[PDB]
Design a protein around this ligand. Sequence first.
Ligand SMILES: *Cc1c(COP(=O)(O)O)cnc(C)c1O
Ligand SMILES: *Cc1c(COP(=O)(O)O)cnc(C)c1O
Ligand SMILES: [Cl-]
Ligand SMILES: [Cl-]
Ligand SMILES: [Cl-]
Ligand SMILES: [Mg+2]
Ligand SMILES: [Mg+2]
Ligand SMILES: [Mg+2]
Ligand SMILES: [Mg+2]
Lengths: 387, 386
Amino acid sequence: EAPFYRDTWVEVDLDAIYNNVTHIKEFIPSDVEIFAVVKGNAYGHDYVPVAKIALEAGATRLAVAFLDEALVLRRAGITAPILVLGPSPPRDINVAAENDVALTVFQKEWVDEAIKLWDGSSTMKYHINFDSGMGRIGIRERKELKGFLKSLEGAPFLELEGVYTHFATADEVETSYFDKQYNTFLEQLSWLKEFGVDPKFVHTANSAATLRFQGITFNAVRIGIAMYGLSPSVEIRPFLPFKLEPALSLHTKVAHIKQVIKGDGISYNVTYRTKTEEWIATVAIGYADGWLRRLQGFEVLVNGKRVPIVGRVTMDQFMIHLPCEVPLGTKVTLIGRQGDEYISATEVAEYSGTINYEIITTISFRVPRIFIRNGKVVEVINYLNDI
Amino acid sequence: APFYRDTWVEVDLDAIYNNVTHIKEFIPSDVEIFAVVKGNAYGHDYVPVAKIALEAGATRLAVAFLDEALVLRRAGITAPILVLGPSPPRDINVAAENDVALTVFQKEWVDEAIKLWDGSSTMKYHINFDSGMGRIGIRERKELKGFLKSLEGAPFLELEGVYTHFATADEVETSYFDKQYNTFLEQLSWLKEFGVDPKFVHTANSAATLRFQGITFNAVRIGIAMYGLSPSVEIRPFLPFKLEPALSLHTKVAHIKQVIKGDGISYNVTYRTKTEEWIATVAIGYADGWLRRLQGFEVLVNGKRVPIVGRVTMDQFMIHLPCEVPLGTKVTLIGRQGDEYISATEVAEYSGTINYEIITTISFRVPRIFIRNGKVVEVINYLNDI
Ligand SMILES: *Cc1c(COP(=O)(O)O)cnc(C)c1O
Ligand SMILES: *Cc1c(COP(=O)(O)O)cnc(C)c1O
Ligand SMILES: [Cl-]
Ligand SMILES: [Cl-]
Ligand SMILES: [Cl-]
Ligand SMILES: [Mg+2]
Ligand SMILES: [Mg+2]
Ligand SMILES: [Mg+2]
Ligand SMILES: [Mg+2]
């Protein structure tokens, strides 16, 4: 339990993550594996505890965005397979090999450069990304694949572990583009067949695709958002096959409370004035914590009541208009439950003109995370203590 | 200090040194500077910024909350540090033990601190007077009296200074600033009426310090101007000297492809190509603090402004280029590249926000490279530390 000295914190309920992974594992075929996707500081829940609980719940593999994230996991004693999903520079080849991290590799040019940087003994695992319509990274054309495979002839130290694609629209109700991607991916698999390469270990499905569609499980699925207990989109939420259990909540405490006379200003540039004598509370969280200025006017929870953020959000603090005096130290919930009220990360996202993924994942490293298992605090991680 | 993705922040320590030096020479010789390093030094990193600011003549540091102060203490910084934000009473002993001053302004805080005191430590505090910011601080005379009463039972709390903060010092027109100033003088009069010397008075942030007479008192608290950025566009022409931006943000072309006419880019196919287009991908996204609302913003590639196309993803985004470039081509998101410069303000304007928010929210997962005399002197990759 790392110490922390501001009463602002994230709570991660490891039971929720465990349950979500267990439920997805039950839902997919028995011969299909789960990559627990922990990119972006585990979508703001913290790399290591999420990886550990997901593995305990039956995920067998992990995925991250870039190599440094994988190394966090390795230094924590995790030995499960780890795949980097984003692109990596060729200079990463020996370090990834040494740390048993597979990279996404999909360019002849990368292979050409890796040959130049290879230490002459390391074997690095890779997965081919096929771009079937996401348009981000990955191979798109047959002749492109051919060239890539030709370059690999000069790089025996690169060992294919698997092959994958990613869906751009699986969280949309209408499924035309998803169907096109699926058909394109099968065409792309047939290029490998033509060129004499076994894809070995095929994976396509994110949370949305996994929880919707038949016949896209292949050998493994890659679960991010649903593991954290949130719907990939508002439009598919109503028809998920079972209830997802949100893992993350975000809380602070009333740091000051005062009665502000009618007409007085609150915060930078005096964008709010009290309409009567008003109870104004202040809390020690702000945009440096990832709680952005665009959340001005959003309603947080105090005593199970929705109360608005008033005046400009500052770097480290914001102000709230309460109906009644409350004691200093009163719990203020930004994401989560008080009484019969619940503020979801999606509701925060909607007010903010964004998506839940971005809200959770941008909660700053300066905010401590408290980890709960069976209702009890089992770990506190305060990254500020580490730096 | 190693890092394994070609995405990074560069912090020019010369720029910070020069800004602090210029402020020091602009203000009276008997006025101290707090280097304000809250929010991971506005995204530039707590420790190197504290170090260079002190070298340049700042004498004190300020942070938002106690954990930030402890980062500095663990790094061997020994200069005074003040926590500007509120702190829970349970912080009393740890603050004292680490020679950190807290902002204290509530009888209730003192009452609780008395309960939690370890019985030996002495803690320094500054009184915050709220002269119109409406955030924290004492507002009323009777409230001040109750606070001083409560102190009679807490002989282990030691006054180090008194301050307020301006809400509108970055606005051209000055009515609200003048109102706060007059209110603050009244609040100081109350303190002096109650027999208490304020000892060490400070009020001015970057905008107030650079603009106004009679508000330097004993010290000024500099954030944004230390980092080389104007508190606002509207006061930028009024600044007494040129500020030198310290922070830039870069990445490299990680993929490049020619995408046929009509094909989709990124989630929900919000962009389709008009012709056969060159589309580049870079390894930075919203988990790095580069938000979805920057879709359509123009970044710099080979000294040319080129648009972000399709939805920004967690760790990557795409760019439409007029021509093929090699893998590894530098992409600049904030700062200078060739014949172009993108200010944090420009990013902020497109984003519907302010420069402060842009720089401060660059994630701890992005490495910072520190430049002094045109040379790399330090690399900090917080991911290696956790
Ligand atoms: C983000 C990501 C995932 C996880 O997606 P969710 O919607 O969070 O399930 C899976 N695969 C790739 C390639 C990703 O980028
Ligand atoms: C943020 C802050 C500062 C620094 O303000 P700049 O505009 O960045 O100079 C000074 N004092 C207090 C109390 C602050 O919160
Ligand atoms: Cl992809
Ligand atoms: Cl189906
Ligand atoms: Cl304040
Ligand atoms: Mg008044
Ligand atoms: Mg309560
Ligand atoms: Mg339980
Ligand atoms: Mg007395």
